[PDB]
Amino acid sequence: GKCRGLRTARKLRSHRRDQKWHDKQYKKAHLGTALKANPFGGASHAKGIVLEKVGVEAKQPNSAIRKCVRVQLIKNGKKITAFVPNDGCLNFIEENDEVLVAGFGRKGHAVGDIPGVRFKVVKVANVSLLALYKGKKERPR
Amino acid sequence: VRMNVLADALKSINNAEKRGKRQVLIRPCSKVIVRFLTVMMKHGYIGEFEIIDDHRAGKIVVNLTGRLNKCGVISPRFDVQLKDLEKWQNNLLPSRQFGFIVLTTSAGIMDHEEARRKHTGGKILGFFF
Amino acid sequence: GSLARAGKVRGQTPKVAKQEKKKKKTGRAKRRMQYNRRFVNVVPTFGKKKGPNANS
Amino acid sequence: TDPIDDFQVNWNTKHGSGVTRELMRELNGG
Amino acid sequence: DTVTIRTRKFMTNRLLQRKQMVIDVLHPGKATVPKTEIREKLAKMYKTTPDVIFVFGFRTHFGGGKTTGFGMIYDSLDYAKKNEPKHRLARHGLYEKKKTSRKQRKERKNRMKKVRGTAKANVG
Amino acid sequence: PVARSWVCRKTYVTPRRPFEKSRLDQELKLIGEYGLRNKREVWRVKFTLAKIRKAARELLTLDEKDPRRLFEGNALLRRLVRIGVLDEGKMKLDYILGLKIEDFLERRLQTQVFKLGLAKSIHHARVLIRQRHIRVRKQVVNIPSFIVRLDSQKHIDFSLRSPYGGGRPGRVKRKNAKKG
RNA sequence: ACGGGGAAUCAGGGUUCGAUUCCGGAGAGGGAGCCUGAGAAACGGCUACCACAUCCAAGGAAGGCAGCAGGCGCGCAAAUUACCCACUCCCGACCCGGGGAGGUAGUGACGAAAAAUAACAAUACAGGACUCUUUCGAGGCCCUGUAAUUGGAAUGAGUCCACUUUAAAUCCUUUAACGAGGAUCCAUUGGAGGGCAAGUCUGGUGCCAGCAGCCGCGGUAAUUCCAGCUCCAAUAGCGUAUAUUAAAGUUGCUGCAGUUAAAAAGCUCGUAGUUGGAUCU
**CATH code of residue B116:** 3.30.1490.10
Residues B36 and B78 in one domain: no
Asked if the Cβ–Cβ distance from C3 to A55 is below 8 Å, we say yes
3-state helix, strand, coil in chain E (%, to 5): 35, 25, 40
Asked if the Cβ–Cβ distance from F31 to C31 is below 8 Å, we say yes
Q: Which domain holds residue B108?
A: 69-129
CB atoms near residue F35 (< 10 Å): 25
Which residue, E108, E87, E81, E64, is CA-closest to E16? E81
Residue A5, phi then psi, degrees to nearest 5 = -135, 145
- Closest CA to the C1' of G84: that residue is E102
Between the alpha carbon of residue E93 and those of residues E19, E50, E52, E85, E97, the distances in Å are 21, 13, 13, 13, 11
Give distance CA C17 / C1' G263 (Å).
Answer: 65
- Domain borders along chain F are 18-180
The residues of F between 128 and 167 with beta carbon within 7 Å of nucleic strand G are 130-133, 140, 143-145, 161-163
Helices (H) and strands (E) counted in chain C, each on its own, are 2, 0
Residues B35 and B93 in one domain: no
Q: Which residues of E touch F (CB under 8 A)?
A: 28-29, 61-65
**CATH code of residue B14:** 3.30.1370.30
End-to-end CA distance of chain F: 63
In DSSP notation, chain F reads: --S-------S----SSTT-HHHHHHHHHHHHHHT-SSHHHHHHHHHHHHHHHHHHHHHHTS-TT-HHHHHHHHHHHHHHHHTTSS-TT--SGGGTTT--HHHHHTTBHHHHHHHTTSSSSHHHHHHHHHTT--EETTEE---TT-B--HHHHT-EE--TTSTTSSS---HHHHHHHHH-
State the Cα–Cα distance between residues E45 and F1, nearest whole angstrom: 45
E61 contacts: CB under 8 Å, gap ≥ 6: E67, E68, F139
Between the alpha carbon of residue E123 and those of residues A80, D13, E101, E106, the distances in Å are 64, 94, 17, 13
CB atoms near residue E92 (< 10 Å): 19
3-state secondary structure of D27: helix
Give distance CA E122 / C1' G81 (Å).
Answer: 28
B121 contacts: CB under 8 Å, gap ≥ 6: B79, B80, B81, B82, B84, B85, B103, B105, B115
Residue C41, phi then psi, degrees to nearest 5 = -110, 130
State the Cα–Cα distance between residues A104 and B63, nearest whole angstrom: 69
Which residue, A47, A66, A48, A49, is CA-closest to A57? A66
- Strands (E) in E36-109, as ranges, are 53-60, 66-74
Asked if residues F31 and F39 have their Cβ atoms less than 8 Å apart, the reply is: yes
A118 contacts: CB under 8 Å, gap ≥ 6: A103, A104, A106, A108, A109, A110, A111
Residues B47 and B76 in one domain: no
Task: Spell out the alpha helix ranges (H) of chain D.
Answer: 3-10, 16-27
- Amino acid identity of F159? S
Residues B56 and B75 in one domain: no
Query: Based on the structure, what is the number of domains in chain E?
Result: 1
- Amino acid identity of A79? K
Where does residue E37 fall: left (phi above 0), alpha (psi -120 to 50 degrees), or beta otherwise?
A: alpha
Task: Give the nucleotide at minimum CA-to-C1' distance from C43.
Answer: G127
Q: Which domain holds residue E93?
A: 1-124
3-state secondary structure of E11: strand
Asked if residues B90 and B2 have their Cβ atoms less than 8 Å apart, the reply is: no
Angle between helices F39-60 and F67-82 (to 10 degrees): 150
**Which nucleotides in chain G have some atom under 7 angstroms from a protein Cβ?**
12-13, 21-22, 74-77, 82-87, 98-104, 111-121, 126-128, 143-148, 152-156, 162-168, 173-176, 178-180, 182-184, 186-187, 190, 192-201, 203-205, 207-219, 222-236, 240-244, 250-258, 264, 273-280
Which residue, E58, E84, E73, is CA-closest to E13? E73
End-to-end CA distance of chain A: 72
Give distance CA F10 / C1' G76 (Å).
Answer: 28
Q: How was this structure determined?
A: cryo-EM
State the Cα–Cα distance between residues C56 and D3, nearest whole angstrom: 11
Buried b (16+ CB within 10 A) or exposed e, F148-157: beeebeeebb
From B19, B37, B68, the end of a domain falls on B68
**CATH code of residue E74:** 3.30.70.3370
Residues B119 and B94 in one domain: yes
The residues of A between 33 and 72 with beta carbon within 7 Å of nucleic strand G are 42-47, 58, 61-67
Residues B80 and B39 in one domain: no
Residues B52 and B113 in one domain: no
- Domain borders along chain A are 1-141
State the Cα–Cα distance between residues F66 and B119, nearest whole angstrom: 12
Which residues pair with residue A83 across a beta bridge? A68, A120
Query: Based on the structure, what is the number of domains in chain B?
Result: 2
